C-alpha cells in the first residue's frame, strides 16, 4: 500500500492545466482574470480553492453536470459565429464586471438589450453542418425591479425558447430583488444546449436572453477536473491524487480515492505487508 | 483588496488565556489556510501554527502543544488564536498571515504567506 | 530545519546587497519595516510577487539562496528573514552615511 505523496503534481506525461483563480466556469465564460484561459487544452484541469467570481452574479442549475462534461470535452476552444441579432442592441454590460478600465462582460456571452425603443421577437438559427458535437451556452436575465425590465427590454416579460430538431428548453425570466452579490441584486441563470452534428439551433426570444457569441468545440476524450492545491511540478507521474503526484509501482494506496491516470485502487487499511522470504526462525 | 484585521493589544496576568481574532475581507476565509506567527520584541520571527480553514485541522509546534487552540468562526469570516496557561515569556505581537494551500496539501510546506495584519501586541506581564 | 544567515549589513543607499540563507532541507523572504508587518518579498527561491521591484532578485544554488537588492534606496531599510516550518535568523539592513 502507497501510503504517502510527494505533494506535487507532475507536469508531464499528463497536460495540466493549472487554473489560478480561476475555476472551469469562470475560463468559459470569459471572467476578465481568466482571458488568459482562453483556447486552453489539458488532460487534467487542476482547479484550486483560491478561484473566485468577479463578475455579474450568475448561477448554474445543474453546475455539476456542465463542469463535469466541459471537464470531459478536454479543451476551451471557443469559435465565434455570426449572429444576426436584428432591432436590438448588441454588446450589453455593467459596472460589477470590469473588463479593462471600464464596464464589461462576460468575453462568450452578448447581452442583447432594445434597440432605441423597441425589442424584436429575435428569431435566429445556426446549423450544425460539421461532424462534431457543439456546445452553445446561453443565459437568462433575471432583473431586480420591474422598471429594469421594462428600461431594459420592452416586453413587460420575455421569454426564451432554446431549440433543436428532437428538444426544446424555454425559460421564462422572473424579476425580483436578490441577495447583493458585487453591488447587484440581479442574477444571470447558465443554461447549454448541445447540437449534434446534422442539427439546427433555433433560438425566439422576445426579451432577457444573454445571447452565445459562438459554439464550443466538443471532444471526447481523457480529460477530466480535480480540486486539489497540491503545487505543479516538473517531473514523470502516471497517477495524480489531490494530494499531489504518486509513483504506481504498488498495486494500491491510502492517499485519496479521487485519482485519475494509471492510478492503484483505494482501500481503507493504510498497510498491508506481503512476505517475501521465508518463515523466520533465528537463533536463541 | 485583501485585508487581515487583528484584534487590539491584550495586557494579561501570567497563567491566565488569551483569545486573539483575525477578521478577513476581499476573500473568502474557507479559501485560503492561516498561519499564526509570534515575534518577541526585537527576537525575530516565530512561526506559531497552522489552521486549515474548511476542513478545521491545526498544526502548532511542540513548544506550544497542548496551551494554543485554533479555531475558526466561518460565519463572520473570523479566525481565532487563544494561547492557554499564559507565561510572562510570551509577550508578543501576534500575525495571522494567509497561506494558500487548504485542499490536498497542507498548505505551509509549499506556500508564502502573501498576506499579513497589522498585528496584536499580546503582553503577559509587567 | 535550520536557516543561516549574515546578521546585519549596514550600506548606503544605492547599491547591491547580497544575503544568504543556507536551507539544510521553498525558501520564502520576508522584509519587516521597523513598526510594520512583514512583508513578502519573494517566494520560490526566486520569485518576486506583486508589487515587489525588479531590483529585488533572488539566486538559487544547490543549498544556497541568495536575496540580491539592487538601486537600494529608504524604504529597503528593514529586517530580512528567510523561510523554509522554520524561520532564518533574522538580517538587518542599515542604511550608511
Known amino acids: 500500500v502507497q501510503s504517502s505523496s510527494t505533494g506535487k503534481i507532475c507536469n508531464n506525461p499528463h497536460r495540466i492545466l493549472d487554473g489560478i483563480d480561476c475555476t472551469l466556469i469562470d475560463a468559459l465564460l470569459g471572467d476578465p482574470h481568466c482571458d488568459v484561459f482562453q483556447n486552453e487544452t489539458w488532460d487534467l484541469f487542476v482547479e484550486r480553492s483560491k478561484a473566485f467570481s468577479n463578475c455579474y452574479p450568475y448561477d448554474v442549475p445543474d453546475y455539476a453536470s456542465l463542469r463535469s462534461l466541459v471537464a470531459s470535452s478536454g479543451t476551451l476552444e471557443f469559435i465565434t459565429e455570426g449572429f444576426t441579432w436584428t432591432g436590438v442592441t448588441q454588446n450589453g454590460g455593467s459596472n460589477a464586471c470590469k473588463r479593462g478600465p471600464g464596464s464589461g462582460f462576460f468575453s462568450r456571452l452578448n447581452w442583447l438589450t432594445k434597440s432605441g425603443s423597441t425589442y424584436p421577437v429575435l428569431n435566429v438559427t445556426m446549423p450544425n453542418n460539421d461532424n462534431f458535437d457543439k456546445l452553445y451556452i446561453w443565459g437568462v436575465h433575471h432583473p431586480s425591479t420591474n422598471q429594469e425590465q421594462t428600461s431594459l427590454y420592452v416586453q413587460a416579460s420575455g421569454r426564451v425558447t432554446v431549440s433543436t430538431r428532437r428538444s426544446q428548453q424555454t425559460i421564462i425570466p422572473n424579476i425580483g430583488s436578490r441577495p447583493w452579490v458585487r453591488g447587484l441584486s440581479s442574477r444571470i441563470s447558465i443554461y447549454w444546449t448541445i447540437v449534434k452534428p446534422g442539427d439546427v439551433l433555433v433560438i425566439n426570444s422576445n426579451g432577457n436572453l444573454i445571447a452565445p457569441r459562438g459554439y464550443f468545440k466538443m471532444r471526447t476524450g481523457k480529460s477530466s477536473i480535480m480540486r486539489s492545491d497540491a503545487p505543479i511540478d516538473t517531473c514523470i507521474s502516471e497517477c495524480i491524487t489531490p494530494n499531489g503526484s504518486i509513483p504506481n509501482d504498488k498495486p494500491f494506496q491510502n492517499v485519496n480515492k479521487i485519482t485519475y491516470g494509471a492510478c492503484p485502487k483505494y482501500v481503507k487499511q493504510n498497510t498491508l505487508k506481503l512476505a517475501t522470504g521465508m518463515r523466520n526462525v533465528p537463533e536463541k | 483588496q485583501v485585508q487581515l484585521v487583528q484584534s487590539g493589544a491584550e495586557v494579561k496576568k501570567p497563567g491566565a488565556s488569551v483569545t486573539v481574532s483575525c477578521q478577513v475581507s476581499g476573500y473568502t476565509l474557507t479559501s485560503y489556510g492561516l498561519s499564526w506567527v509570534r515575534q518577541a520584541p526585537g527576537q525575530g520571527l516565530e512561526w506559531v501554527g497552522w489552521i486549515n480553514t474548511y476542513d478545521g485541522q491545526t498544526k502548532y509546534v511542540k513548544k506550544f502543544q497542548g496551551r494554543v487552540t485554533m479555531t475558526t468562526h466561518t460565519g463572520t469570516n473570523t479566525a481565532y488564536m487563544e494561547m492557554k496557561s499564559l507565561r510572562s515569556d510570551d509577550t508578543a505581537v501576534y500575525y495571522c498571515?494567509?497561506?494558500?494551500?487548504?485542499?490536498?496539501?497542507?498548505?505551509?510546506?509549499?506556500?508564502?504567506?502573501?498576506?499579513w495584519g497589522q498585528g496584536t501586541m499580546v503582553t503577559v506581564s509587567s | 530545519s535550520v536557516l543561516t544567515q549574515p546578521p546585519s549589513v549596514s550600506g548606503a543607499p544605492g547599491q547591491r546587497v547580497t544575503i544568504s540563507c543556507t536551507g539544510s532541507?521553498?525558501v520564502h523572504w520576508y522584509q519587516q519595516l521597523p513598526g510594520t508587518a512583514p512583508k513578502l518579498l519573494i517566494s520560490?527561491?526566486?520569485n518576486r510577487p506583486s508589487g515587489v521591484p525588479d531590483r529585488f532578485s533572488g539566486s538559487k544554488s544547490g543549498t544556497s539562496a541568495s536575496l540580491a537588492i539592487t538601486g537600494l534606496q529608504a524604504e529597503d531599510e528593514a529586517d530580512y528573514y528567510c523561510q523554509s516550518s522554520v524561520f532564518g535568523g533574522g538580517t538587518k539592513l542599515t542604511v550608511l552615511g
Open positions: 520560490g527561491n526566486s
Open positions: 498571515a494567509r497561506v494558500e494551500g487548504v485542499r490536498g496539501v497542507m498548505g505551509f510546506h509549499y506556500y508564502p504567506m502573501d498576506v
Open positions: 532541507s521553498a
